[PDB]
Write a protein that binds this ligand. Sequence first.
Ligand code: 8SW
Ligand code: FE
Length: 705
Amino acid sequence: VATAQEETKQAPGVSIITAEDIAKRPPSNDLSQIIRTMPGVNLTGNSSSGQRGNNRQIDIRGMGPENTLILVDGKPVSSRNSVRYGWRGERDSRGDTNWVPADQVERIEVIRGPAAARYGNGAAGGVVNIITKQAGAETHGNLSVYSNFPQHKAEGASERMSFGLNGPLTENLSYRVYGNIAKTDSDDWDINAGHESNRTGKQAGTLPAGREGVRNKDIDGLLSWRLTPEQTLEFEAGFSRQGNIYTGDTQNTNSNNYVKQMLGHETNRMYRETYSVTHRGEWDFGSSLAYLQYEKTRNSRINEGLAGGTEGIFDPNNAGFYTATLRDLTAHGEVNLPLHLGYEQTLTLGSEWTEQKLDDPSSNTQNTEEGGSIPGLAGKNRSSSSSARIFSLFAEDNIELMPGTMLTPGLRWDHHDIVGDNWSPSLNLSHALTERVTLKAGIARAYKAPNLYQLNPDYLLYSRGQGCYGQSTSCYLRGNDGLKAETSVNKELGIEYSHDGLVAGLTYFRNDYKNKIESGLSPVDHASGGKGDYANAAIYQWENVPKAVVEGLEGTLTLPLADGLKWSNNLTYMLQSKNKETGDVLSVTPRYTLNSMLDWQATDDLSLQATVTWYGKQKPKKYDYHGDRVTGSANDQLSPYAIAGLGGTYRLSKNLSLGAGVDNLFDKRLFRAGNAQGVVGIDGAGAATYNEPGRTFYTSLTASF
Ligand SMILES: C#CCNC(=O)[C@H](CNC(=O)[C@H](CNC(=O)CNC(=O)c1cccc(O)c1O)NC(=O)c1cccc(O)c1O)NC(=O)c1cccc(O)c1O
Ligand SMILES: [Fe+3]
């Protein structure tokens, strides 16, 4: 009997991307590009402001990217938690899917809804687990190189070069190492000129930036030592560095002179260092796994403001870099025990402990002189430091009820040192109706701890009125340590026909989303003192939005037209996404997304690929920061559109393949006009918040032994 962990990787809410899929749709740089084509996955911001809108990240079933937990070889990636979380729920972050280089990935696992809740904190949407190629019984290695070439030159081209080498040292000692260097160029500063929202006053000439660029350096070493036939001990260290290439991005799309000085410059750099020890054992009466991970993330970037329009724009009064540091510590143990009597079943016991320490000398520095002081909050020299610790125990049991039929109950208990106890129960069922048809169902309660910015009372944003809910008076936004965790009851009912390479399936999912954390709507208090008409500014906190809901359909259809010819489709359809308190939308996703590949292995040494992605309509948020129906261009929608691509790979030998193709064959292009709503002298842009890149040719070479 399979463990509950391996078994639940067979739910309809589960997708696998292989190393061979990566070869046939090679990503520019970030893996999000290919990860997003799975059913139930979008590439979206975290809320609906449209801020930092070219910085979109992986979203599972509309639940936001903060609810997508990224693992590498089963170990958490937490680095984006080192970037400032803004009034509107975005971070100036490119996300956490670009730390492992695409050509060293063996496979990617995407686990959605109820089969993912067992992973705990931050899996309310789901889990994406990036697995790296590993050593075997013989020295192996590869060299992979990529390059694209956009028709339009303003758009940023990507150059990417990686190697891997792996194999034996001793009989009982293996190594696996890789190194990657990559560069996606920034879009030209001016790429959105003519598409920018209307720009009055002093904001005349300001521009929504295109896509930011990134320089990557990744180096990983792994050493695998066989103590015994029954025990293995693995040591690994990782060093990654991303530095951007800045092209005019600012939270509000306003500008100043520091912005313009910095065009082309590196204005943020993220160093990520990972060390890990892993014990793995296969035994007489089961197996077991224990690991320790230390992740240290240094986020160095230029000081930005924290008030109204100055929020998220470089500040000339505090010019220069600062460094936020994230130390994240993760320990994990589990034993797997096959039990034979009664039913065939496999029981799994485990605990987990995590600590997140965050040092950030910049985000807590807003002073209170204009809006009046806030009892209990020092105006200067507040602490940089946050932390939270979670302890967790769990038990999952995968019970063969009769052959065909599997029932897999679990319980996880989580103790957060500030927020308290959480109980996440789960039930995952698969039953076989035929050699060909399988019914599956799942219900779990997933868990999300407040992030360290939401939770901190020293974290303080300010606006003179334009961001304030329900008024034009000055207001403050303040963290809250009395917050409850977000929980979500992720239901799924799904059915699948599968036979002779022919697959046809359709899943319904509903996630009932309790206590989503968001900026509050009522002032809890008022500050006293200050200057002029801004004196005695309102005080709001980060609050738990009591109930929200997402709902949709995942579908997939795969037919073998002939021996050498396969037609595949992944389908996402978003039925509902609602803050039930404000009736506004949680996330801006396309109404549907259909991904379609035709794969012809026309020859033994030649495969050809055609792809079509159809995106549906996209609607912006209906309400502004004040909470009032928006007006003008702020209502603009994106009409449905499709991106098509052709590509191929030619086997020159066993040891060498060429690849080449075209993304966006019909040069369908979109442009970021700004943010979804209007501010003073800056007309809204509704759903037009991102740059879709135009026709782009690409080539590739892979040599391997
Ligand atoms: C040029 C120009 C546009 N200028 C303004 O809109 C001025 C003066 N402020 C500024 O120009 C910049 C830049 N302003 C902009 O680029 C346009 N505003 C925004 O994008 C904005 C977005 C969300 C919330 C806000 O409060 C915003 O001002 N903002 C600030 O210096 C500022 C500092 C502390 C507190 C604030 O609220 C500030 O606005 N502020 C106001 O008119 C204002 C009036 C009521 C409420 C506000 O929030 C205002 O900013
Ligand atoms: Fe303002």
